[PDB]
Design an enzyme around this catalytic site. Structure first.
Site, PDB file in Angstrom:
ATOM      1  N   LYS A   4       0.825  -1.204   0.000  1.00  0.00           N
ATOM      2  CA  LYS A   4       0.000   0.000   0.000  1.00  0.00           C
ATOM      3  C   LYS A   4       0.859   1.254   0.000  1.00  0.00           C
ATOM      4  O   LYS A   4       0.581   2.203  -0.740  1.00  0.00           O
ATOM      5  CB  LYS A   4      -0.937   0.010   1.205  1.00  0.00           C
ATOM      6  CG  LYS A   4      -1.921  -1.125   1.251  1.00  0.00           C
ATOM      7  CD  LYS A   4      -2.831  -0.981   2.448  1.00  0.00           C
ATOM      8  CE  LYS A   4      -2.046  -0.974   3.738  1.00  0.00           C
ATOM      9  NZ  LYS A   4      -1.603  -2.333   4.125  1.00  0.00           N
ATOM     10  N   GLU A  30       1.034   5.768  10.989  1.00  0.00           N
ATOM     11  CA  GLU A  30       1.979   4.996  10.198  1.00  0.00           C
ATOM     12  C   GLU A  30       3.380   5.125  10.792  1.00  0.00           C
ATOM     13  O   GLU A  30       3.565   5.648  11.891  1.00  0.00           O
ATOM     14  CB  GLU A  30       1.932   5.443   8.739  1.00  0.00           C
ATOM     15  CG  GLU A  30       0.671   5.019   8.029  1.00  0.00           C
ATOM     16  CD  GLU A  30       0.483   3.522   8.025  1.00  0.00           C
ATOM     17  OE1 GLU A  30      -0.262   3.007   8.878  1.00  0.00           O
ATOM     18  OE2 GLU A  30       1.089   2.855   7.168  1.00  0.00           O
ATOM     19  N   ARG A  31       4.368   4.617  10.062  1.00  0.00           N
ATOM     20  CA  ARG A  31       5.748   4.654  10.530  1.00  0.00           C
ATOM     21  C   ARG A  31       6.293   6.074  10.493  1.00  0.00           C
ATOM     22  O   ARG A  31       6.144   6.780   9.495  1.00  0.00           O
ATOM     23  CB  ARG A  31       6.616   3.748   9.668  1.00  0.00           C
ATOM     24  CG  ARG A  31       6.229   2.298   9.710  1.00  0.00           C
ATOM     25  CD  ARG A  31       7.160   1.482   8.854  1.00  0.00           C
ATOM     26  NE  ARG A  31       6.760   0.084   8.801  1.00  0.00           N
ATOM     27  CZ  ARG A  31       5.823  -0.392   7.993  1.00  0.00           C
ATOM     28  NH1 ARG A  31       5.190   0.419   7.165  1.00  0.00           N
ATOM     29  NH2 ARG A  31       5.522  -1.678   8.008  1.00  0.00           N
TER      30      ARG A  31
HETATM   31  N1  LIG Z   1       5.463  -2.523  -6.369  1.00  0.00           N
HETATM   32  C1  LIG Z   1       6.356  -3.450  -5.599  1.00  0.00           C
HETATM   33  N2  LIG Z   1       7.388  -4.049  -6.194  1.00  0.00           N
HETATM   34  C2  LIG Z   1       8.199  -4.885  -5.517  1.00  0.00           C
HETATM   35  N3  LIG Z   1       8.020  -5.153  -4.257  1.00  0.00           N
HETATM   36  C3  LIG Z   1       7.013  -4.596  -3.591  1.00  0.00           C
HETATM   37  C4  LIG Z   1       6.121  -3.691  -4.289  1.00  0.00           C
HETATM   38  N4  LIG Z   1       5.208  -3.294  -3.366  1.00  0.00           N
HETATM   39  C5  LIG Z   1       5.513  -3.898  -2.207  1.00  0.00           C
HETATM   40  N5  LIG Z   1       6.547  -4.625  -2.406  1.00  0.00           N
HETATM   41  C6  LIG Z   1       7.150  -5.415  -1.366  1.00  0.00           C
HETATM   42  O1  LIG Z   1       6.217  -5.493  -0.198  1.00  0.00           O
HETATM   43  C7  LIG Z   1       6.991  -4.792   0.910  1.00  0.00           C
HETATM   44  C8  LIG Z   1       6.073  -3.972   1.711  1.00  0.00           C
HETATM   45  O2  LIG Z   1       5.919  -2.702   1.103  1.00  0.00           O
HETATM   46  P1  LIG Z   1       4.832  -1.642   1.810  1.00  0.00           P
HETATM   47  O3  LIG Z   1       4.123  -0.826   0.703  1.00  0.00           O
HETATM   48  O4  LIG Z   1       5.584  -0.682   2.752  1.00  0.00           O
HETATM   49  O5  LIG Z   1       3.735  -2.534   2.672  1.00  0.00           O
HETATM   50  P2  LIG Z   1       2.290  -1.985   3.202  1.00  0.00           P
HETATM   51  O6  LIG Z   1       1.174  -2.677   2.421  1.00  0.00           O
HETATM   52  O7  LIG Z   1       2.136  -2.285   4.654  1.00  0.00           O
HETATM   53  O8  LIG Z   1       2.212  -0.508   2.985  1.00  0.00           O
HETATM   54  C9  LIG Z   1       7.988  -3.962   0.244  1.00  0.00           C
HETATM   55  O9  LIG Z   1       9.148  -3.757   1.101  1.00  0.00           O
HETATM   56  C10 LIG Z   1       8.376  -4.748  -0.912  1.00  0.00           C
HETATM   57  O10 LIG Z   1       9.326  -5.764  -0.489  1.00  0.00           O
HETATM   58 MG   LIG Z   2       2.496   1.053   4.785  1.00  0.00          MG
END
Ligand SMILES: Nc1ncnc2c1ncn2[C@@H]1O[C@H](COP(=O)(O)OP(=O)(O)O)[C@@H](O)[C@H]1O
Ligand SMILES: [Mg+2]
Ligand SMILES: Nc1ncnc2c1ncn2[C@@H]1O[C@H](COP(=O)(O)OP(=O)(O)O)[C@@H](O)[C@H]1O
Ligand SMILES: [Mg+2]
Lengths: 161, 54, 156, 35, 110, 271, 161
Positions: A4, A30-31
């Site tokens: 997300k 969030e963080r």
């Molecule tokens: N578009 C992407 N391409 C490659 N890896 C991804 C992508 N989106 C997420 N990831 C992987 O999933 C992990 C979590 O990303 P994040 O967006 O911070 O999670 P959240 O859904 O909690 O926001 C990332 O560190 C990455 O390893």
């Molecule tokens: Mg997040």
């Protein structure tokens, strides 16, 4: 951890830089290091200018280290900034809210202490009306436009939550 | 003999190509005329309505 | 707006193989133009000036607009294309009637020949010269084969 | 749990029903012509 | 009711084995666009064309567009039969044959 | 929902039981097929010793071709029928691209069912009820009669079968079928005494029956092995899905008990 | 939607016309359109006689629009009519109750308001004893016979509810 924040940062990169109007980022529960990353990346990319008045983004942060009241009202603070930009300026606004679920969750955390009978899954009985009161202000009127991107956390991957 | 008479029947049916072409020319001109009348009507009414709305 | 109703398979039987696409495009445009004449009325609704006489407090702008509109000459487009397809239809009818007279000549010849075949003498009063007159493919090639039996021995 | 494949209505129950209906419509056509 | 009892029976029989081509024809005939509510006479004409066999000669992919064209034709030169179906509420054997020949001619021309 | 998960559990458990029983049945049939494949292989390979010692080479310019494909009426094998169909389609393409008029024969309903939608103009006859009972020489004799009592005087033929290598491995092989004119016109056959066209006709008919029998006895063993391994894999996958769904079911039943407790407790706390 | 109402109307037709013993029908928490339909079916088929009062069915109706108390006691009202016919006349009686689940359901709808801790699946704690005190009166004694046909709604096709 499904992407997300990665997707919303990609949308900030692909739309907000190419955007003609203003932008507001409301970090909600969030963080904090993610907020620091976003701040410094926007300074590097010139979207935030520390020396003159050419900045195009306003940041409002109440993060996951905050007590539930701040986490419940910081989204409203970001809404107020975006609503000013939409109404009194007539601008086209971009409003990114990550994460909006925290809003609801924060209300849950106080709902018991306010002395209310819990609803399904322990949530406040006012979940839907609180969410509606918040979300109906996040809108395009015939006085100005607001394009809104909201990251919505799904607890335990349950979309029926 | 049968084949030749059938060829004559087709020759007798030939005229539909030019009927089609004439139909299309007439219909295209009518569509253009009516679209032009709607355009002039819409512009006049639209300006009068901007005045009434302000 | 008097149109010629058209059969749509008869239109198909008379289309050569170098303009099948053109026939299909004419058909598609016929259907499109029918649909588009159906989805718009004939005459625009001339709005009464009432809602614009008694609801516009401006100095005669509605009135001069209505004057300029009452006397507008909107350009009626001219045909400029039906006369030449009429000429082409005349030319095609000429060619087709010529070919049809040719076909009638061929048909009268075929009818003469079928009468000839129908009036053959029965085959048991028939000589061999009579057979070589009736079915000329039954004639001995006495030029390619000059000597008896005037045909290949395997043919026998 | 007898008949639980068809009872679950999955991709295997639908194909089971299709098989039964195909076979028995073929058999019904075969039994009607011989009547 | 006349057209729809048979359509319901055939759609059930198609769901049992999903004949099959008629079933696919009826399925792709049940599809509809948005904000386009059809009149009951046009619905009856379409379900007639689909339930009498006039759609098994066409591939399932083109069915939809045929319908459009069909409707156009029927609402351009056959307002009499639609008004008849509308007023009487039922189809008569006369009007049955009328719509029969109309759809046969249109399928021949399609 | 708990009832959906229980339905799916029961369904996949039944599927796992059935595939395990089918694997055992395929093992029992493969034992007999591999037992009967030894004398059948001696027979069918001694039938071909002549064309390997006389080195018949077939014609390069002849026109008509007959292509036989050996499979069965039963599925759940794997790449048996698909291998046969791929070889048949490839060969039909490569022959028709050389102008040769090709006619197809399919032993077993699966190969005909696969090829009848695209290759049906190029088709002569097909055969049914192959796979339930083990193949016999009567089956090969019947196929050879209906290939002879058909009026299609072919110039050359091929037969595409699944040669059995091991329990895990089979290979789609192809064997040639010569006409009377190919073995009569061969210069290497001048050393075979007391031969005329009649004995060569009888010999070629019998060898057609023999090569069909040998192909059937190889394909049955290959197919029983393939079906055994396929049902084994199906049981493995069903057990995997059963384990994952049992985890999900325990999770969901714990959640349901907790939710009902929470409902009762919140009802009691509001009094 | 499986056919309880159609089946109970078929049983009404068959048995209650093959019967001469003062049938009774109790509509408990069901649709009013269905009640009107049954009333007019009975008027048309001579079972109810508007003039020349020789009818042979009594009707008791408390439908969905009624509050929970009415839907909880209407089954007892119909039961009481049938009980009079059985005991005070000795007659053999038919009793058709559609739908009896509503009876139980009605109780639940007041349970929390009567000050009672909920039981399992949201039902009253007294579900079994209420059902027992109502059902043990619908019975054949030595005084007379009551043939009872009850439609029982199964929520979500459970049968373990
Ligand atoms: N578009 C992407 N391409 C490659 N890896 C991804 C992508 N989106 C997420 N990831 C992987 O999933 C992990 C979590 O990303 P994040 O967006 O911070 O999670 P959240 O859904 O909690 O926001 C990332 O560190 C990455 O390893
Ligand atoms: Mg997040
Ligand atoms: N015996 C039947 N024959 C044909 N259709 C039936 C029959 N019973 C029910 N149905 C169909 O199922 C529908 C449900 O009827 P209903 O008796 O009201 O079910 P329920 O009372 O259990 O909800 C009916 O409208 C009807 O379409
Ligand atoms: Mg009911």
């Amino acid at each position: 951890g499904v992407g997300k924040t990665v997707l919303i940062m990609e949308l900030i990169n692909n739309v907000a830089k190419a955007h003609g109007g203003y932008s507001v980022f409301a970090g909600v529960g969030e963080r904090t290091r993610e907020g620091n990353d976003l701040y410094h990346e926007m300074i590097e990319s010139g979207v935030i200018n520390l020396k003159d008045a050419t900045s195009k983004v306003a940041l409002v942060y109440g993060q996951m280290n905050e007590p539930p009241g701040a986490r419940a009202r910081v989204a409203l603070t970001g809404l107020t900034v975006a609503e000013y930009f939409r109404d009194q300026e007539g601008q086209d606004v971009l409003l990114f809210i990550d994460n909006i679920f925290r809003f609801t969750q924060a209300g849950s955390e106080v709902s018991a202490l306010l002395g209310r009978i819990p609803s399904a899954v322990g949530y406040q009985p006012t979940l839907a009306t609180d969410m509606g009161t918040m979300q109906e202000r996040i809108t395009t009127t015939k006085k100005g436009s607001i394009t809104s991107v909201q990251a919505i956390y799904v607890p335990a991957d349950d979309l029926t939550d | 003999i049968d084949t030749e008479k059938s060829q004559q029947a087709l020759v007798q049916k030939r005229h539909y190509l030019f009927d089609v072409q004439r139909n299309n020319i007439a219909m295209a001109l009518e569509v253009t005329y009516r679209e032009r009348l709607y355009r002039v009507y819409k512009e006049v009414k639209n300006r009068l309505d901007y005045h009434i709305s302000v | 707006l008097a149109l010629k109703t058209i059969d749509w398979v008869a239109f198909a039987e008379i289309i050569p193989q170098n303009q099948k696409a053109i026939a299909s495009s004419l058909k598609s445009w016929n259907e499109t133009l029918t649909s588009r004449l159906a989805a718009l009325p004939e005459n625009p609704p001339a709005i009464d000036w009432a809602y614009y006489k008694a609801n516009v407090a401006k100095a005669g702008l509605v009135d001069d607009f209505e004057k300029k509109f009452n006397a507008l000459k909107v350009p009626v487009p001219e045909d400029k294309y039906t006369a030449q397809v009429d000429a082409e239809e005349k030319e095609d009818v000429k060619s087709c009637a010529e070919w049809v007279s040719l076909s009638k000549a061929r048909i009268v010849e075929y009818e003469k020949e079928m009468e000839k075949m129908k009036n053959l003498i029965p085959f048991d009063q028939m000589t061999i010269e009579d057979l070589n007159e009736a079915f000329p493919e039954t004639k001995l090639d006495k030029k390619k084969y000059p000597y008896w039996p005037h045909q290949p021995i395997e043919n026998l | 749990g007898a008949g639980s494949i068809r009872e679950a209505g999955g991709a295997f129950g639908k194909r089971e029903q299709a098989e039964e209906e195909r076979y028995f419509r073929a058999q019904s056509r075969e039994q009607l012509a011989a009547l | 009711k006349q057209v729809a009892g048979t359509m319901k029976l055939e759609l059930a029989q198609y769901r049992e084995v999903a004949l099959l081509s008629r079933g696919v024809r009826l399925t792709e005939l049940l599809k509809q666009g948005q904000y386009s509510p059809m009149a009951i006479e046009e619905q009856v004409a379409v379900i007639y064309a689909g339930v009498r066999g006039y759609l098994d000669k066409l591939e399932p992919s083109k069915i939809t567009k045929f319908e459009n064209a069909f409707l156009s034709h029927v609402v351009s030169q056959h307002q009499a039969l639609l008004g008849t179906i509308r007023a009487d509420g039922k189809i008569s054997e006369q009007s049955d044959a009328k719509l029969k020949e109309i759809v046969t001619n249109f399928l021949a021309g399609f | 929902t708990l009832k959906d998960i229980t339905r799916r559990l029961k369904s996949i458990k039944n599927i796992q039981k059935i595939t395990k029983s089918m694997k055992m049945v395929a093992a029992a049939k493969y034992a007999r097929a591999e037992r009967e494949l030894k004398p059948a292989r001696i027979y069918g390979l001694g039938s071909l010793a002549l064309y390997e010692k006389a080195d018949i080479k077939g014609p390069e310019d002849k026109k008509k071709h007959l292509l036989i494909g050996v499979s069965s009426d039963r599925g759940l094998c794997g790449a048996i029928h698909s291998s046969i169909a791929k070889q048949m389609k490839s060969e039909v393409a490569t022959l028709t691209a050389a102008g040769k008029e090709v006619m197809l024969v399919g032993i077993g309903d699966k190969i005909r069912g696969i090829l009848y939608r695209t290759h049906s103009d190029q088709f002569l006859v097909a055969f049914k009820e192959v796979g339930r009972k083990p193949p016999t020489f009567g089956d090969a004799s019947v196929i050879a009669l209906e290939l002879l009592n058909s009026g299609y005087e072919f110039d050359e033929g091929s037969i595409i079968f699944n040669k059995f290598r091991s329990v895990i491995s089979y290979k789609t092989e192809e064997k040639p079928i010569f006409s009377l004119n190919t073995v009569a016109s061969a210069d290497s056959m001048s050393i075979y005494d007391d031969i005329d066209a009649d004995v060569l006709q009888n010999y070629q008919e019998y060898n057609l029956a023999n090569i069909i029998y040998y192909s059937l006895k190889e394909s049955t063993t290959s197919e029983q092995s393939a079906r055994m391994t396929a049902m084994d894999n199906a049981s493995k996958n069903a057990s995997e899905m059963i384990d994952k769904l049992t985890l999900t079911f325990n999770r969901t039943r714990q959640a349901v008990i907790t939710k009902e407790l929470i409902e009762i407790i919140s009802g009691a706390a509001a009094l």
